Amino acid sequence: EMFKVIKTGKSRSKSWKRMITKHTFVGEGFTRRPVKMERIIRPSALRQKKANVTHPELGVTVFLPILAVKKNPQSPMYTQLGVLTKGTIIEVNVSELGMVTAGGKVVWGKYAQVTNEPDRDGCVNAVLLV
Amino acid sequence: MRVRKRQSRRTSTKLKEGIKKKASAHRKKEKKMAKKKDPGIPSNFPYKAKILE
Amino acid sequence: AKSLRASSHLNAKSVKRRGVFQKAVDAREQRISDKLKEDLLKQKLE
Amino acid sequence: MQLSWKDIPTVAPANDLLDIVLNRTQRKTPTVIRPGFKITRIRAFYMRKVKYTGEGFVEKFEDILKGFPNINDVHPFHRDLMDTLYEKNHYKISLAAISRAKSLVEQVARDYVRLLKFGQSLFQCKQLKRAALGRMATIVKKLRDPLAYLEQVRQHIGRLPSIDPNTRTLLICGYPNVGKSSFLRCITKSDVDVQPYAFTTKSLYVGHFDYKYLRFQAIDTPGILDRPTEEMNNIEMQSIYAIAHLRSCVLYFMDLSEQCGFTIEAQVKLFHSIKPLFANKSVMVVINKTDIIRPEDLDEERAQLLESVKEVPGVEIMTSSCQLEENVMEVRNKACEKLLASRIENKLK
Amino acid sequence: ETKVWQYITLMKRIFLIDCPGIVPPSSKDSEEDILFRGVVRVEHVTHPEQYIPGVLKRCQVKHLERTYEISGWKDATEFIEILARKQGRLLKGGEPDESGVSKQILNDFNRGKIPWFVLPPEKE
Amino acid sequence: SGNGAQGTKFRISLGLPVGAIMNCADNSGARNLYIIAVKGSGSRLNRLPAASLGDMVMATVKKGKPELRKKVMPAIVVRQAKSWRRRDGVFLYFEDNAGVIANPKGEMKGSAITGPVGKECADLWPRVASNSGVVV
Amino acid sequence: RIWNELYKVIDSSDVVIHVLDARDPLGTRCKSVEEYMKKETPHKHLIYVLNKCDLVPTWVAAAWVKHLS
RNA sequence: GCAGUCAAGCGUUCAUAGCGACAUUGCUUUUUGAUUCUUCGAUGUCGGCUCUUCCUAUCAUACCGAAGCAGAAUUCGGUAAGCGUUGGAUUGUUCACCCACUAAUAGGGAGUGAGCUGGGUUUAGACCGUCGUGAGACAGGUUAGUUUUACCCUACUGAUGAAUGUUACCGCAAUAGUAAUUGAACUUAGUACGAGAGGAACAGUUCAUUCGGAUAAUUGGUUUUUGCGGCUGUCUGAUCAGGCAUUGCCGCGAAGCUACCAUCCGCUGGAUUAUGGCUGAACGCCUCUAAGUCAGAAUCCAUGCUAGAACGCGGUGAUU
RNA sequence: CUCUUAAGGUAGCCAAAUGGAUUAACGAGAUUCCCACUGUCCCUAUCUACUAUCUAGCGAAACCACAGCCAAGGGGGCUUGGCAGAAUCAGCGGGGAAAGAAGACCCUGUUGAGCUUGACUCUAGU
RNA sequence: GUGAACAGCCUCUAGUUGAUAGAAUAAUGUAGAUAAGGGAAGUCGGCAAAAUAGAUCCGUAACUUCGGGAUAAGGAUUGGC
RNA sequence: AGAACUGGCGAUGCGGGAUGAACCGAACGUAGAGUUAAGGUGCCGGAAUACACGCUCAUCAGACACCACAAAAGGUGUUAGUUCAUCUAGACAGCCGGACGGUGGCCAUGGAAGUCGGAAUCCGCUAAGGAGUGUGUAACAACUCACCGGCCGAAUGAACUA
RNA sequence: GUCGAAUUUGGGUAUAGGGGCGAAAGACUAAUCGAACCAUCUAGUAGCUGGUUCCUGCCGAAGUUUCCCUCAGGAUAGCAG
Ligand SMILES: [Mg+2]
């Protein structure tokens, strides 16, 4: 799984292609690769620019933009591909939560681990790493 | 008035073997998951006092 | 639309039948029996 | 539309609404599917199911968005009346929440119809369809209170009297128990309670009657009190708005009898406090229950208070009583005469 | 004509691309304005003749006179009639084919055969 | 069967399939009517709806005044051109198909109808009989 | 269909360019799409182009480029 | 979906060891119908012409309860598949929506991939753009391109046939099927309902849509009656009278056939689903239910009709 | 190491008639639309010549494990039921390792070659 | 002979009566036709039929390489003595 | 899903589960008598429409793999049990009366008196009586219930398990 | 479609197999052409599909372990006599 065998051309023999079947954080500066060099595919409908991170403290939950995929287990080449898959850690813009580290340097980012499987629903829930 | 079709009662040998395999699987699962006051004298007995002594 | 088998229209027709709807058939059968007796007498006369 | 919007789609509580929607989706759309079916078939099945549920929610919301009066830009009279009745701001906030839930259900159905195409397994499409139906239910779950408020205002707004402000009208006014309800009962066929207790009519009443080969609609109003334009209920404010927004010879009934135990000086004070409203209305005062008082015997000091009513040129102190209806015909004749005299002058200009 | 996009190369460092023409829908799309923009094929319009009057709203009369070169029209009905007569286009016995001449008029308006342009906004 | 018609209409042969052109029969200024639907038409698979004399029908103004164009309006047929069996016992047919546009209530639009009008249409629409200067 | 093709060519293009008819560039604008390119993809340049200058007087195209500059 | 709260219960201390039904809090794009001029990679084909049959998760028709149902109109819910569930535009594509009628244009299975059809399993031709030094395919698109029933067997629709001693006539019916459906003009009535705006229902009448069975009384169509009359080329010497021009053509054209393109017809008794009651305990009250029982749906069974067991049957005439 | 933006009112400066490729004619090439037109359709009906039908004479072909009534269960035959009366004639195209055909489409060959190159070994010619 | 013509048809000299046939004219087929009213609403698609067809005269547009378009288009007539 | 071992098939007949790769029985030369397993004893089908004790009316129960996913409960459809309470100084139900007075308690006011709106909810006398469980008026009124008293009388009520 | 021309065609002759010819389709080359036919090597190559013929009695297992880059191809312990 995780790699659909796309087929192309009048004769679908080689097909020269694969496509991810799961959500991915493509990044702000994607700028789609030209199709002739395009082997892997991350269709935009599966992409998400935000995740429903929840802070264990105070019980609050807030929708915040995703920032980067830090550590994906199970062949972190998927982390290079940005896949979440129910457990991948992801950086998030925690500035909305009001977190402020000691010394007056206000925080604006914190790690978070996705919990819900992206494939089974369009929301990307995650528990904040306090 | 217009009687509707009734479900067949036939054993459905295929379904029988499948239910047997599902039962063995459920038994294995219940066994794997297993690792995780006296009533007293019944009322209305004629001789409740005799047992006390 | 009401069905041809509908009980309400059939009961209404049964109620309507009691009057002229039956009297006309009665007078028609009486005239037919009279014409039959006349045809019988016309044959018996000869 | 206007004039008694009885065509409202009979909005239902959000729980029953979500139940009817889920039932219609389960019943109309195909249900059976099997793991061995081609994945494209299961995908089209779940897509048709989600699209049917979303279209049903969109229709259920659009029917309410379209059938409601749209208080704004209807008429100042109906606008002020519905504001006094249903708390216009809350009436707008409820329909705004309805439109917000409709747009949310639309965005959810679209995002899930887009995400559903990529499902590689029957369980994934099933979880996606369940997620869409649950998002639609949660959007409906927050709409319960606004939907109940809309169901209440529909039950109230659908029984409001028909009226066209441009059409000829004659308002009636006076202290409670004065017999103004009896005057409306006598001047027209409209039925109204005439019980002795003060506020026999808690809301506006209307009653058509022909005259001079022309239609007319008497409009009783639910009483008024001498208060400093702030200590008043919606009923009294709804009555004052009916006078302010309706021209053509509002009637100010009065009763000198000991019944309706407010001193006649208080009636003159109320007539003075309401005087500015009648700057163009061509006031026609109408004493009531004359048979039991016959103000010809009235004390000269109390009669002087009537002279203060005469300071405005347009007043006419007609006499009338329920026990002698023949004078009521003369009052209606004078009212229609002043009405035609004003309208014909307005038309020639 | 551009049924689908196709990749193209030049200098090996850049790839040209093209897509079918986009028409952002809006309530102000003023269908006849969609026709004057050329977005629609004139052949399929049910009533080509009814769009004729609007072509005069843009093109100057002197250009339409110099080009055709039929002139002297008013209300554009005499325009279509005299044009169908001078061009030899007519339905049998004997009415002019105002619709077919209107099709050629709209085609010339879309292809630029008749000059026309909106006035640029005045300089500050 | 249609609202606004006085009395029930007896069956007569159809002769105006949807999309049929018919000459205008009134002074409204339309030159011809192009039928697009027939009110009361019997639904059936593969069966094109068709009209008959005196039937109401929606129709666009294929030719005439531009203001009447680009909109469909109800119209009552005043001529069929197809043979039909009158109950009196003689076949007849109009020289050409004709009709008149009208409001859904059936009130006539033009001040008068030009040309002969069929008896079946005038009997069904009293306003058409009032606007018809020649009955048959 | 053409909308999906437009989104595909936009995502795949490092630098979108928007041609405009010289006869009426203001009417040729694809408004609501340029806002999407500005928001979702700020990096995209979306440079304007003004073709068919031959069909309009050169001063008209000059004023058009001066206004769109 | 994610994070969280009470606990009706469970469980060796005991819910605070752990779980936990029914509920509930915070997010998924704005509380003044403001916006929502977003439509974002289905790698795989689905969709359509004639037509039979089946299901309810029922759009309509039929019978009911509730809903601020005064009326009309409308919403939900219970039964109900007996009959209906339409004519088309869009391919700079169509896993779609629009107008218009109709009471309604509800959802599904066998589909019919050798009944036919476009998109397509599209090999041999070619061109445009990409890759690759090249051979060639490919991130594409366009164009044109032979898979051809049965007389075999069986199923179905029609049609013969020895065997009830012979033949002929009149009959009964177990069996299988079944059909009629929907709409609207008078009266009720401008009445109840309404202050008005308009606006019922039942009985009594009358027309219409779809479908089914029939006939040419009248109209249209059809001509090998080559029936009559005419026309062209050619031939029998001319006239008359005749042959060929694949029924040479034309005008009419009977008989037959045939067209809602003409006309007639398509019914009257019981048992029932939901529902509303009776009496009446269970339970010293109550209760449409436990017994019995009344009314009631287009439902079921019957009336009627279609064919009649070729091995179901009766009566009657002759019987060398 | 500095440094990039002026064009004006319906046709212009112009280059030694025109500023054209948006090219005329031509095409069993493909595509969009209009008049006439008509049974493609509403809605199908009729006529003629020859087959198809019986008969006089002659007389095959494909296929054939055997022959062919169905419902359910069996991870056309087997099991339980409905049924079942010789021999047959004409339509028929629902089904039969029934013909006809089934291929296209997927996979492995150590096997055949049409082709290409700074793949390996050779080589006419130079 | 008819006919612009060795275009189509009949006839002259000359050569043939050879293609298995008899009996009716079922369904369904191959070939040739007709049809009241609409005239493409059928079909992916005007697939096939139909419509103008010869001749005399009026008249014939855009474009153009000036040669062509062109029988453009659209109109009046055709018999016999 | 990944490893070890014990077994049937493969190579396997025979009886039963209507038949079946696995189920139960079972040591395959040709026959007779006799005794058995699984499985049955109303017919097809050889054998009791046997005995003794309990539950089942299902508008398609049941003979079903059912000690397995729907399975958590819901049924005023039945039967047997466990626990907690009242009682001849009167158990449930049944019929009648009381259900009192500061009082129309304190806050909103055209009006809320228990019952259109908010925070308390006592004393006084009783056998008891709630600033009030519901019906209904503009309010009241009135009806009614929680509990007591008046009349027959004896077992009655609630939560769970099977 | 063309039918006065790069027109059609009779007879003769020349081009004959990794060759001939080709207004170029891998098209033609005697019903065969991305390489024709005839006789011999030749009964080629078998990774593989198919088959493998009379009777009776006794015994009678197998799908498990190592060794090549490695499927493949096989060698090896083991099982029975
Ligand atoms: Mg009063």
Short mmCIF file of N, CA and C (backbone and C1' of nucleotides) in Angstrom, two decimals, chain I residues 76-113:
data_model
loop_
_atom_site.label_atom_id
_atom_site.label_comp_id
_atom_site.label_asym_id
_atom_site.label_seq_id
_atom_site.Cartn_x
_atom_site.Cartn_y
_atom_site.Cartn_z
P G I 76 -27.04 -27.16 -15.98
"O5'" G I 76 -27.20 -28.72 -15.68
"C5'" G I 76 -28.36 -29.23 -15.03
"C4'" G I 76 -28.30 -30.73 -14.92
"C3'" G I 76 -27.11 -31.29 -14.15
"O3'" G I 76 -27.33 -31.27 -12.76
"C1'" G I 76 -27.37 -32.46 -16.20
P G I 77 -26.12 -31.58 -11.74
"O5'" G I 77 -26.08 -33.17 -11.66
"C5'" G I 77 -27.26 -33.92 -11.41
"C4'" G I 77 -27.20 -35.29 -12.03
"C3'" G I 77 -26.43 -36.33 -11.22
"O3'" G I 77 -27.02 -37.62 -11.41
"C1'" G I 77 -25.37 -36.04 -13.31
P C I 78 -27.06 -38.68 -10.20
"O5'" C I 78 -26.14 -38.02 -9.07
"C5'" C I 78 -25.08 -38.75 -8.47
"C4'" C I 78 -24.78 -38.24 -7.08
"C3'" C I 78 -25.99 -37.83 -6.25
"O3'" C I 78 -26.62 -38.94 -5.63
"C1'" C I 78 -24.34 -36.14 -6.12
P U I 79 -28.22 -39.06 -5.60
"O5'" U I 79 -28.65 -38.17 -4.35
"C5'" U I 79 -28.26 -38.52 -3.03
"C4'" U I 79 -28.69 -37.47 -2.04
"C3'" U I 79 -30.15 -37.04 -2.12
"O3'" U I 79 -31.01 -37.92 -1.43
"C1'" U I 79 -28.77 -35.12 -2.05
P U I 80 -32.52 -38.15 -1.93
"O5'" U I 80 -33.29 -36.85 -1.42
"C5'" U I 80 -33.34 -36.52 -0.04
"C4'" U I 80 -33.97 -35.17 0.18
"C3'" U I 80 -35.31 -34.95 -0.49
"O3'" U I 80 -36.40 -35.50 0.23
"C1'" U I 80 -33.91 -33.10 -0.93
P G I 81 -37.80 -35.78 -0.51
"O5'" G I 81 -38.37 -34.33 -0.80
"C5'" G I 81 -39.48 -34.15 -1.68
"C4'" G I 81 -39.57 -32.72 -2.16
"C3'" G I 81 -40.48 -32.48 -3.35
"O3'" G I 81 -41.84 -32.37 -2.99
"C1'" G I 81 -38.40 -31.42 -3.72
P G I 82 -42.98 -32.86 -4.01
"O5'" G I 82 -42.92 -31.80 -5.20
"C5'" G I 82 -43.18 -30.43 -4.96
"C4'" G I 82 -43.05 -29.61 -6.22
"C3'" G I 82 -43.75 -30.16 -7.45
"O3'" G I 82 -45.14 -29.88 -7.46
"C1'" G I 82 -41.56 -29.47 -8.03
P C I 83 -46.11 -30.66 -8.48
"O5'" C I 83 -45.62 -30.19 -9.91
"C5'" C I 83 -45.75 -31.03 -11.05
"C4'" C I 83 -44.42 -31.20 -11.75
"C3'" C I 83 -44.44 -32.05 -13.01
"O3'" C I 83 -44.87 -31.33 -14.15
"C1'" C I 83 -42.64 -32.73 -11.64
P A I 84 -45.93 -31.98 -15.17
"O5'" A I 84 -45.13 -33.17 -15.86
"C5'" A I 84 -43.90 -32.93 -16.53
"C4'" A I 84 -43.11 -34.20 -16.71
"C3'" A I 84 -43.79 -35.28 -17.55
"O3'" A I 84 -43.61 -35.08 -18.94
"C1'" A I 84 -42.94 -36.23 -15.55
P G I 85 -44.87 -34.76 -19.89
"O5'" G I 85 -44.99 -36.06 -20.81
"C5'" G I 85 -45.29 -37.33 -20.25
"C4'" G I 85 -45.50 -38.37 -21.32
"C3'" G I 85 -46.50 -37.99 -22.41
"O3'" G I 85 -46.11 -38.57 -23.65
"C1'" G I 85 -47.29 -39.90 -21.26
P A I 86 -45.11 -37.78 -24.63
"O5'" A I 86 -44.62 -38.89 -25.66
"C5'" A I 86 -43.72 -39.91 -25.26
"C4'" A I 86 -43.61 -40.99 -26.31
"C3'" A I 86 -42.96 -40.58 -27.63
"O3'" A I 86 -41.54 -40.60 -27.58
"C1'" A I 86 -44.97 -41.72 -28.08
P A I 87 -40.69 -39.48 -28.36
"O5'" A I 87 -41.38 -39.40 -29.80
"C5'" A I 87 -41.22 -40.44 -30.75
"C4'" A I 87 -42.08 -40.22 -31.96
"C3'" A I 87 -41.82 -38.93 -32.74
"O3'" A I 87 -40.72 -39.04 -33.63
"C1'" A I 87 -44.15 -39.18 -32.39
P U I 88 -39.50 -38.00 -33.55
"O5'" U I 88 -40.05 -36.70 -34.29
"C5'" U I 88 -40.90 -35.78 -33.61
"C4'" U I 88 -42.01 -35.29 -34.49
"C3'" U I 88 -41.88 -33.86 -35.00
"O3'" U I 88 -41.05 -33.76 -36.15
"C1'" U I 88 -44.06 -34.19 -34.14
P C I 89 -40.31 -32.37 -36.49
"O5'" C I 89 -41.46 -31.45 -37.09
"C5'" C I 89 -41.89 -31.60 -38.43
"C4'" C I 89 -42.82 -30.48 -38.85
"C3'" C I 89 -42.26 -29.07 -38.70
"O3'" C I 89 -41.44 -28.67 -39.78
"C1'" C I 89 -44.40 -29.16 -37.72
P A I 90 -40.29 -27.56 -39.55
"O5'" A I 90 -41.09 -26.20 -39.32
"C5'" A I 90 -41.71 -25.53 -40.40
"C4'" A I 90 -42.37 -24.24 -39.96
"C3'" A I 90 -41.46 -23.23 -39.28
"O3'" A I 90 -40.71 -22.46 -40.20
"C1'" A I 90 -43.48 -23.45 -38.06
P G I 91 -39.44 -21.61 -39.71
"O5'" G I 91 -40.07 -20.26 -39.14
"C5'" G I 91 -39.24 -19.25 -38.58
"C4'" G I 91 -39.98 -18.43 -37.55
"C3'" G I 91 -39.13 -17.89 -36.41
"O3'" G I 91 -38.48 -16.68 -36.75
"C1'" G I 91 -41.13 -18.86 -35.56
P C I 92 -36.87 -16.59 -36.74
"O5'" C I 92 -36.50 -16.62 -35.19
"C5'" C I 92 -37.11 -15.72 -34.27
"C4'" C I 92 -36.99 -16.23 -32.86
"C3'" C I 92 -35.65 -16.85 -32.49
"O3'" C I 92 -34.71 -15.90 -32.01
"C1'" C I 92 -37.42 -18.31 -31.84
P G I 93 -34.50 -14.48 -32.75
"O5'" G I 93 -33.39 -13.77 -31.85
"C5'" G I 93 -33.66 -13.46 -30.49
"C4'" G I 93 -33.03 -14.46 -29.55
"C3'" G I 93 -31.50 -14.40 -29.47
"O3'" G I 93 -31.07 -14.78 -28.16
"C1'" G I 93 -32.17 -16.52 -30.28
P G I 94 -31.10 -13.72 -26.96
"O5'" G I 94 -31.43 -14.61 -25.68
"C5'" G I 94 -31.43 -14.04 -24.38
"C4'" G I 94 -31.69 -15.08 -23.31
"C3'" G I 94 -30.67 -16.20 -23.21
"O3'" G I 94 -29.49 -15.83 -22.50
"C1'" G I 94 -32.84 -17.11 -23.19
P G I 95 -28.05 -16.29 -23.05
"O5'" G I 95 -27.94 -17.82 -22.63
"C5'" G I 95 -27.76 -18.18 -21.26
"C4'" G I 95 -28.08 -19.63 -21.02
"C3'" G I 95 -27.14 -20.65 -21.63
"O3'" G I 95 -25.95 -20.85 -20.88
"C1'" G I 95 -29.36 -21.29 -22.09
P G I 96 -24.61 -21.35 -21.59
"O5'" G I 96 -24.90 -22.88 -21.95
"C5'" G I 96 -24.91 -23.88 -20.95
"C4'" G I 96 -25.08 -25.26 -21.54
"C3'" G I 96 -24.04 -25.68 -22.57
"O3'" G I 96 -22.84 -26.15 -21.98
"C1'" G I 96 -26.21 -26.17 -23.38
P A I 97 -21.47 -25.33 -22.15
"O5'" A I 97 -20.34 -26.37 -21.75
"C5'" A I 97 -20.26 -27.64 -22.39
"C4'" A I 97 -19.06 -27.73 -23.30
"C3'" A I 97 -18.84 -29.06 -23.99
"O3'" A I 97 -19.64 -29.23 -25.15
"C1'" A I 97 -16.79 -28.30 -23.07
P A I 98 -21.12 -29.85 -25.04
"O5'" A I 98 -22.07 -28.58 -24.97
"C5'" A I 98 -21.70 -27.35 -25.58
"C4'" A I 98 -22.07 -27.32 -27.04
"C3'" A I 98 -21.23 -26.40 -27.91
"O3'" A I 98 -19.99 -26.95 -28.30
"C1'" A I 98 -23.51 -26.02 -28.36
P A I 99 -18.75 -25.99 -28.66
"O5'" A I 99 -19.02 -25.59 -30.18
"C5'" A I 99 -18.99 -26.57 -31.21
"C4'" A I 99 -19.74 -26.13 -32.43
"C3'" A I 99 -19.07 -25.07 -33.30
"O3'" A I 99 -18.08 -25.60 -34.16
"C1'" A I 99 -21.35 -24.51 -32.98
P G I 100 -16.71 -24.80 -34.40
"O5'" G I 100 -17.16 -23.29 -34.57
"C5'" G I 100 -17.78 -22.83 -35.77
"C4'" G I 100 -18.17 -21.38 -35.67
"C3'" G I 100 -17.06 -20.44 -35.21
"O3'" G I 100 -16.19 -20.04 -36.26
"C1'" G I 100 -19.00 -20.04 -33.93
P A I 101 -14.80 -20.80 -36.49
"O5'" A I 101 -14.31 -21.18 -35.02
"C5'" A I 101 -13.54 -20.27 -34.25
"C4'" A I 101 -14.36 -19.10 -33.79
"C3'" A I 101 -13.63 -18.06 -32.96
"O3'" A I 101 -12.84 -17.16 -33.73
"C1'" A I 101 -15.67 -18.57 -31.91
P A I 102 -11.28 -16.95 -33.39
"O5'" A I 102 -11.27 -16.42 -31.88
"C5'" A I 102 -11.58 -17.30 -30.80
"C4'" A I 102 -10.79 -16.98 -29.56
"C3'" A I 102 -10.99 -17.98 -28.41
"O3'" A I 102 -9.79 -18.07 -27.65
"C1'" A I 102 -11.62 -15.86 -27.69
P G I 103 -8.43 -18.64 -28.30
"O5'" G I 103 -7.77 -17.38 -29.02
"C5'" G I 103 -7.45 -16.20 -28.29
"C4'" G I 103 -7.58 -14.96 -29.16
"C3'" G I 103 -6.79 -13.74 -28.71
"O3'" G I 103 -5.43 -13.79 -29.13
"C1'" G I 103 -9.00 -13.10 -29.26
P A I 104 -4.39 -12.66 -28.64
"O5'" A I 104 -5.08 -11.29 -29.05
"C5'" A I 104 -4.49 -10.04 -28.70
"C4'" A I 104 -5.53 -8.96 -28.54
"C3'" A I 104 -5.34 -8.04 -27.34
"O3'" A I 104 -4.40 -7.00 -27.58
"C1'" A I 104 -7.59 -8.76 -27.44
P C I 105 -3.00 -6.99 -26.80
"O5'" C I 105 -3.42 -7.13 -25.27
"C5'" C I 105 -4.26 -6.17 -24.65
"C4'" C I 105 -4.61 -6.57 -23.24
"C3'" C I 105 -3.50 -7.22 -22.43
"O3'" C I 105 -2.58 -6.28 -21.89
"C1'" C I 105 -5.48 -8.47 -22.18
P C I 106 -1.06 -6.71 -21.63
"O5'" C I 106 -1.15 -7.75 -20.43
"C5'" C I 106 -1.59 -7.33 -19.14
"C4'" C I 106 -1.29 -8.36 -18.08
"C3'" C I 106 0.07 -9.05 -18.19
"O3'" C I 106 1.13 -8.26 -17.68
"C1'" C I 106 -1.61 -10.67 -17.80
P C I 107 2.62 -8.47 -18.24
"O5'" C I 107 3.05 -9.89 -17.68
"C5'" C I 107 3.10 -10.13 -16.28
"C4'" C I 107 3.46 -11.56 -15.97
"C3'" C I 107 4.72 -12.09 -16.64
"O3'" C I 107 5.90 -11.69 -15.97
"C1'" C I 107 2.98 -13.69 -16.84
P U I 108 7.30 -11.64 -16.76
"O5'" U I 108 7.71 -13.18 -16.88
"C5'" U I 108 7.97 -13.96 -15.72
"C4'" U I 108 8.45 -15.34 -16.08
"C3'" U I 108 9.56 -15.39 -17.12
"O3'" U I 108 10.84 -15.14 -16.57
"C1'" U I 108 7.88 -16.96 -17.67
P G I 109 12.13 -15.15 -17.52
"O5'" G I 109 12.21 -16.66 -18.01
"C5'" G I 109 12.82 -17.00 -19.26
"C4'" G I 109 12.28 -18.31 -19.79
"C3'" G I 109 13.12 -18.95 -20.89
"O3'" G I 109 13.08 -20.37 -20.76
"C1'" G I 109 10.96 -18.45 -21.74
P U I 110 14.09 -21.11 -19.76
"O5'" U I 110 15.43 -21.26 -20.60
"C5'" U I 110 15.47 -22.08 -21.76
"C4'" U I 110 16.19 -21.41 -22.91
"C3'" U I 110 17.72 -21.52 -22.87
"O3'" U I 110 18.23 -21.64 -24.20
"C1'" U I 110 17.09 -19.24 -22.88
P U I 111 18.05 -23.01 -25.02
"O5'" U I 111 17.37 -22.55 -26.38
"C5'" U I 111 16.12 -21.87 -26.38
"C4'" U I 111 15.68 -21.48 -27.77
"C3'" U I 111 16.64 -20.56 -28.51
"O3'" U I 111 16.62 -20.86 -29.91
"C1'" U I 111 14.54 -19.49 -28.28
P G I 112 17.71 -20.21 -30.89
"O5'" G I 112 16.86 -19.22 -31.80
"C5'" G I 112 15.78 -19.72 -32.59
"C4'" G I 112 15.27 -18.69 -33.56
"C3'" G I 112 16.05 -17.38 -33.65
"O3'" G I 112 17.23 -17.48 -34.43
"C1'" G I 112 13.72 -16.94 -33.61
P A I 113 18.33 -16.32 -34.37
"O5'" A I 113 17.59 -15.05 -35.00
"C5'" A I 113 17.22 -15.02 -36.38
"C4'" A I 113 16.08 -14.06 -36.63
"C3'" A I 113 16.52 -12.67 -37.11
"O3'" A I 113 15.56 -12.15 -38.04
"C1'" A I 113 15.34 -12.47 -35.07
#
